């Protein structure tokens, strides 16, 4: 449950540390994004000399949410933060790594590259 | 609010037509099988102190 104003940790080596969502890309007026949704966000904080800097307007896919997400098998899964991975307009990651686990929902939604890059898929 | 207030005095006819539902209904009473006195059903007879065919309470 990510919406405009929501901060996210970035889970990659692009150089951003925190991005703040300003728009969820899922139709004309989707209220929330979840795992596997592409958001548009501003970069609020970054490390020196990254591929990205504070102030940019970038796109990212949400990989972990703190509101638990439900699955067809009757289970659920939930992470301790809300994080995302920055992308280009081809749904490909922009960094060369991703940190921490990511949700298996990403695979189903076609963010294949990210899933293999992830240390664990839960 | 702006202090609503009646626009016209109510006609005798219309005040009394509002009261068309104000009549009391007579109390509902049954004889007591012991002392034959009229009493509310499901209550202890306040005349002779009987309810359910036994003396319950000192009248």
């Amino acid at each position: 449950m990510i919406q405009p104003q929501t901060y996210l940790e970035v889970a990659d080596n692009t150089g951003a540390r925190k991005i703040m969502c300003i728009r969820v890309l899922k139709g004309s007026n989707a209220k929330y994004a979840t795992v596997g949704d592409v958001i548009v966000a501003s970069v609020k904080e970054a490390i020196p000399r990254g591929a990205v800097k504070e102030g940019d307007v970038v796109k990212a896919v949400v990989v972990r949410t703190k509101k638990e997400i439900k699955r067809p098998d009757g289970s659920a899964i939930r992470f301790d933060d809300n994080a995302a991975v920055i992308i280009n307009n081809q749904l490909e990651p922009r960094g060369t790594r991703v940190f921490g686990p990511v949700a298996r929902e990403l695979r189903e939604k076609g963010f294949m590259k990210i899933v293999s890059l992830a240390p664990e898929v839960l | 609010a702006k202090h609503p207030v009646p626009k016209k005095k109510t006609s005798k006819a219309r005040r009394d037509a509002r009261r068309s539902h104000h009549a009391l209904t007579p109390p509902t009473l049954v004889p007591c099988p012991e002392c034959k006195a009229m009493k509310p059903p499901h209550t202890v007879c306040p005349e002779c102190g009987y309810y359910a065919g036994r003396k319950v309470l000192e009248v």
């Binding site: - | 209550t43 202890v44 007879c45 309470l57």
Partner: protein
């Protein structure tokens, strides 16, 4: 809405409703019969019946439980010694409520007696 909720509020806040049930039970386990309003009467049935049942068990735990509501060591003793035993074979229903025929003058409240069963 109030769907499937159990137990009246009796226009008393939480701790006052509580003292009410206690003081009623105190009065009831003392005189064996009292008069109250009908709603008050119906609510007392359960509250006392539970205490009486605990006297029937007789153990130490039971006494200390009961003593939380009733508070009076003498009265508890009476409940345990005199009251309880005359219910050893009675399985629930240790009290009865019967409705009185005349309302109160000052407020028209329907009255009823509540008493301990023979």
């Amino acid at each position: 809405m109030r769907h499937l909720k159990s137990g009246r509020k009796l226009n008393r806040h939480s701790s006052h409703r509580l003292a009410l049930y206690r003081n009623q039970a105190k009065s009831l386990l003392t005189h064996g019969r009292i008069t109250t309003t009908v709603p008050k009467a119906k609510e007392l049935r359960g509250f006392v019946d539970h205490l009486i049942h605990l006297a029937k068990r007789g153990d130490l735990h039971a006494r200390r439980l009961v003593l939380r509501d009733l508070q009076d060591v003498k009265l508890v003793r009476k409940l345990f010694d005199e009251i309880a035993p005359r219910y050893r074979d009675r399985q629930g229903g240790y009290t009865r409520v019967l409705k009185l025929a005349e309302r109160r003058r000052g407020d028209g409240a329907p009255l009823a007696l509540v008493e301990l069963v023979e």
